[PDB]
Amino acid sequence: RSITLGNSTITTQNVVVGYGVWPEYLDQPTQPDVATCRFYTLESVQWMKNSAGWWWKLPDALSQMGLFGQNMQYHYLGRTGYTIHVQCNASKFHQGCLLVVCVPEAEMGCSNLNNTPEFSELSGGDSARMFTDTQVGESNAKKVQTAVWNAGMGVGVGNLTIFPHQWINLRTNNSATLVMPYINSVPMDNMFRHNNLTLMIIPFVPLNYSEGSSPYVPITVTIAPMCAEYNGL
């Protein structure tokens, strides 16, 4: 309860950690720790009745967030781990169920059958992109196919639980916590050309309430980099 890191502090009370490993350290690298290990709270999204889902690309959502956005442009390479806190706050009269998963290397498919999606439509800079519950048209040039029952990757949406996941059920649970190590082939990669993780939030059983209650339940995502090291002189 009431953990602190750097100059930021959140309040907690079960944590699922990666593929069984904890994030740890390894020309020559430098390791900065006093100015990157803090909780960058992304701003809150709203969960309405006919909502579909959200996704963030992970070393892209912190590209403008303070000093971590400066070390992405100054240093060429780097490798980090992450620690994700998700918590939505509803009363005892709401109902629903989320799925918080963290997909590594989530390559998405374009709407047009021949092209590839552009940069502005894969990742919103510190802003959540949205799935849809209908199809995306074929006639538009280059946009991400966001049919939520195929999860944008051409896969079954039910089988997405093989990745490290955690259920948020508003009857009994309220929050979720994930710890993800660095999963890549090369031991140190670029941070602009590549997005090695993807955090997805999908509502399976949709929100429902009576007449009178507040018609939206906000979600809060809080990310903190762990054991980061860059490469340069």
Epitope: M48, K49, N50, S51, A52, M130, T132, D133, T134, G137
Partner: antibody
Framework: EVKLVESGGGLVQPGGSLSLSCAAS????????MNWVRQPSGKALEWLGF??????????EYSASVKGRFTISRDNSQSILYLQMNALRAEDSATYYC????????????????WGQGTSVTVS | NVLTQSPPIMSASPGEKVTMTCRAS???????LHWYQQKSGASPKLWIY???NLASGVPARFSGSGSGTSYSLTISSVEAEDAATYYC?????????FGAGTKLELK
């Protein structure tokens, strides 16, 4: 009750521009998909495009023939719906409707339940 | 994908049982095919959605059926207010194509 009126039609030169407007009353406007269906003089109907509700990000999906020429948008303050037309040709003389969509189960079948009274646009 | 209705003009006396068809070029799913009814000089109205379910405020004489690529709408008893034009709609990919139209003239 669902009450949809639309206005803005009239005569316009080929190669010109014209902006329609469809007003909605009697329901929550930020919850339903809003379509646009035109129809020529006693012929088969044609579908133009719709605009999604607030829970899906207010995106648009035009048809193939009117892509780049027409533009569907809504106004943030009050409940009204627009359609911006550009580069009109001789075959765009039709009767324009303004339909609503709804969720039947929790699914979205592609039906159009409530239609407007229909405005007319001619070119010459 | 195109829809071809048949027949274009169809006449029926009051009291008989009549039917029309709506044939697609490719396979259209059974939950994405609807029927409309437009009277003379009026806005169209939704009649049957998801190929077998009645709309709100429609009489119980109408009933749709069919699957695969051939669908049909049959009227049990013809009355005096159901003389109009009927369209069928589909969706397999964008755009949403309407049918040609079957006109029902009373006898």
């Amino acid at each position: 009750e669902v009450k949809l009126v639309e206005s803005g039609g009239g005569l316009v030169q080929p190669g010109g521009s014209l902006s329609l407007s469809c007003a909605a009353s009697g329901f929550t406007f930020t919850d339903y998909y809003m379509n646009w269906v035109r129809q020529p003089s006693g012929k088969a109907l044609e579908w133009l495009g719709f605009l999604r509700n607030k829970a899906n990000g207010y995106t648009t999906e035009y048809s193939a023939s009117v892509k780049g020429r027409f533009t569907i948008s809504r106004d943030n303050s009050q409940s009204i719906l627009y359609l911006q037309m550009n580069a009109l040709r001789a075959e765009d003389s039709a009767t324009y409707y303004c339909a609503r969509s709804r969720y039947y189960g929790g699914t979205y079948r592609y039906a159009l339940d409530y239609w407007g009274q229909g405005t007319s646009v001619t070119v010459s | 994908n195109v829809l071809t209705q048949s027949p274009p003009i169809m006449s029926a006396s009051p009291g008989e049982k009549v039917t029309m068809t709506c044939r697609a070029s490719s396979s259209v799913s059974s939950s994405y095919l609807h029927w409309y009814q437009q009277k003379s000089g009026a806005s169209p109205k939704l009649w049957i959605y998801s190929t077998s379910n009645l709309a709100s405020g429609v009489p119980a004489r109408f009933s749709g059926s069919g699957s695969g690529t051939s669908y049909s709408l049959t009227i049990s008893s013809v009355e005096a207010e159901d003389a109009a034009t009927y369209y069928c709609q589909q969706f397999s990919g964008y755009p949403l194509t309407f049918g040609a139209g079957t006109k029902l003239e009373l006898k």
